[PDB]
Amino acid sequence: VNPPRVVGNWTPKDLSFEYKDVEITTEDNVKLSGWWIDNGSDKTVIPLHGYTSSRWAEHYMRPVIEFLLKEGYNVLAFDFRAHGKSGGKYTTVGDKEILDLKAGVKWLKDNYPEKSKRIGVIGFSMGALVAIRGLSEVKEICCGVADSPPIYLDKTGARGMKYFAKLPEWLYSFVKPFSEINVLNYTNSIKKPLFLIIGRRDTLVKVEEVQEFYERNKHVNPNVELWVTDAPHVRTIQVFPEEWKSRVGEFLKRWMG
Amino acid sequence: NPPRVVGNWTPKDLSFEYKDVEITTEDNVKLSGWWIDNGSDKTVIPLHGYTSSRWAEHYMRPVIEFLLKEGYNVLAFDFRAHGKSGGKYTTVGDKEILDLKAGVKWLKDNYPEKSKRIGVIGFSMGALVAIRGLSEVKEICCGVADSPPIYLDKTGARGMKYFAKLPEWLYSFVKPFSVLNYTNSIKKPLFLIIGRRDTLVKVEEVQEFYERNKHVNPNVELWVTDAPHVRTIQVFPEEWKSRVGEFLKRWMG
Numbered sequence: 285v286n287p288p289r290v291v292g293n294w295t296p297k298d299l300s301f302e303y304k305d306v307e308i309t310t311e312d313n314v315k316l317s318g319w320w321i322d323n324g325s326d327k328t329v330i331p332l333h334g335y336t337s338s339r340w341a342e343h344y345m346r347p348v349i350e351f352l353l354k355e356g357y358n359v360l361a362f363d364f365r366a367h368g369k370s371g372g373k374y375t376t377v378g379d380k381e382i383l384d385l386k387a388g389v390k391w392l393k394d395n396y397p398e399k400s401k402r403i404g405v406i407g408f409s410m411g412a413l414v415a416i417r418g419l420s421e422v423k424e425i426c427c428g429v430a431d432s433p434p435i436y437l438d439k440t441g442a443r444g445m446k447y448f449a450k451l452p453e454w455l456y457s458f459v460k461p462f463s464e465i466n467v468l469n470y471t472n473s474i475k476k477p478l479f480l481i482i483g484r485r486d487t488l489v490k491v492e493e494v495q496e497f498y499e500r501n502k503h504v505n506p507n508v509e510l511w512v513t514d515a516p517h518v519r520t521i522q523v524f525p526e527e528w529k530s531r532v533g534e535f536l537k538r539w540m541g
Numbered sequence: 542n543p544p545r546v547v548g549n550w551t552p553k554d555l556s557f558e559y560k561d562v563e564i565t566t567e568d569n570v571k572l573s574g575w576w577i578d579n580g581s582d583k584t585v586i587p588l589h590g591y592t593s594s595r596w597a598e599h600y601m602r603p604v605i606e607f608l609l610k611e612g613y614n615v616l617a618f619d620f621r622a623h624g625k626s627g628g629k630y631t632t633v634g635d636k637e638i639l640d641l642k643a644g645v646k647w648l649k650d651n652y653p654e655k656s657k658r659i660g661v662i663g664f665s666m667g668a669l670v671a672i673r674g675l676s677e678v679k680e681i682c683c684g685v686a687d688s689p690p691i692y693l694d695k696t697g698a699r700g701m702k703y704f705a706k707l708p709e710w711l712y713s714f715v716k717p718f719s720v721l722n723y724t725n726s727i728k729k730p731l732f733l734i735i736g737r738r739d740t741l742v743k744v745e746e747v748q749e750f751y752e753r754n755k756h757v758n759p760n761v762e763l764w765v766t767d768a769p770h771v772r773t774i775q776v777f778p779e780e781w782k783s784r785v786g787e788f789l790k791r792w793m794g
């Protein structure tokens with residue numbers, strides 16, 4: 285069962301940029317909907333949204349797209365399969381979505397090579413998982429930012445989909461029906477710069493889980509960083525915008541070149 | 542367009558013979574139901590709540606069982622866009638009056654000698670429809686309204702305070718799914734039921750309805766219970782069945 289499709293009302297035009305509505309087709313023939321935002325750069329950053337969300341998400345996608353454009357990067361921003369306006373019959377919460385990222389990268393190199401000499405990625409939640417995987421498996425990606433990445437998908441899924449309070453009964457009963465990948469393996473294969481962000485108030489992903497990833501990856505990656513904040517799930521950029529942009533900005537600056 | 546719930550039981554599991562029936566509304570919606578002939582000249586229609594269906598095991602199954610034990614025929618259909626019924630949009634009590642009106646006409650047309658008297662029993666949204674029906678459908682001789690949302694906007698906002706306790710992703714899934722003028726037109730027997738523990742409807746709200754309607758209706762009654770939303774029949778099944786049974790016996794003839 286896919287989550288409801290969420291589509292916002294704003295466009296890159298509201299950010300004072302021209303944009304193209306584009307269609308990206310995956311290795312497995314899913315048609316994705318996205319924006320290509322040309323900023324006159326040779327570098328592109330792809331911001332990846334979270335489960336049940338889309339490219340419009342006002343509390344983190346709008347700010348990060350506006351931040352990326354401000355920083356001067358080009359932006360490719362698309363909806364994951366089964367989300368927003370994108371096709372695909374099923375979301376796989378981080379599994380087949382690697383193909384979504386792969387297709388986005390391929391699309392950049394096929395259509396705008398000179399606008400994507402360097403490609404970076406920023407992921408939130410599910411998108412953060414995909415960022416991690418892409419940073420390992422997709423060679424064209426030079427660096428990645430992973431904000432609130434689910435490390436133990438089983439536990440995180442349980443935290444976000446289950447509700448245990450029996451009273452009132454009408455609520456417990458109404459939601460109960462809805463409550464129906466080895467990420468740590470990637471700590472041995474990622475050798476590129478990776479910026480992990482995790483909030484102390486995050487009820488879906490624990491600090492210790494992300495910290496586990498960091499310390500295991502540190503032994504093969506001198507350029508993995510961990511930032512532990514006081515925000516809840518994917519909301520560091522909402523609660524600590526200037527500091528979020530400062531740290532991620534400096535990180536992109538350094539490795540995007 | 543909420544999530545269609547369909548249960549695992551039939552009137553066989555109640556030891557009664559039944560037919561699966563198809564009822565078409567005035568605005569051409571195709572409803573699915575059970576017609577359960579009990580050898581009676583009197584029929585009662587139990588009406589389920591929003592996001593539910595005719596199977597709801599905590600109140601529909603017990604009322605249908607109870608009604609058959611009492612000797613009434615039963616027509617029980619899923620409201621539009623619920624259960625197995627047609628229609629794509631639910632209007633949360635608005636156009637659902639037509640579903641009820643369809644059922645009444647279906648009884649009158651196909652089995653009139655089994656529907657010389659027709660009563661309704663509604664739960665939650667279903668109770669609003671029962672109230673509306675008692676006002677607008679002439680062939681309905683009496684009605685039971687268990688936990689009717691009197692102030693719909695207030696009731697929705699209470700629901701919202703609870704949805705906000707949900708984790709983030711679960712909330713995303715259920716987010717889309719988040720009357721006193723009838724007090725002057727209802728002059729037929731009405732049994733109102735409200736629980737003190739109801740988190741969606743206030744006893745005070747149902748009391749306001751009761752007080753206003755009795756200006757024009759000598760046979761409106763109010764039972765205030767110690768139960769949660771539509772669960773008076775679950776928490777106090779004996780007393781619920783005694784009072785409603787007595788109410789029905791008196792007015793169904």
Ligand SMILES: CCCCCC(=O)SC
Pocket residue numbers: 453454458589590591592593597664665666700770771
């Ligand atoms: C929002 C769900 C309200 C349903 C109450 C029941 O227990 S069935 C009508």
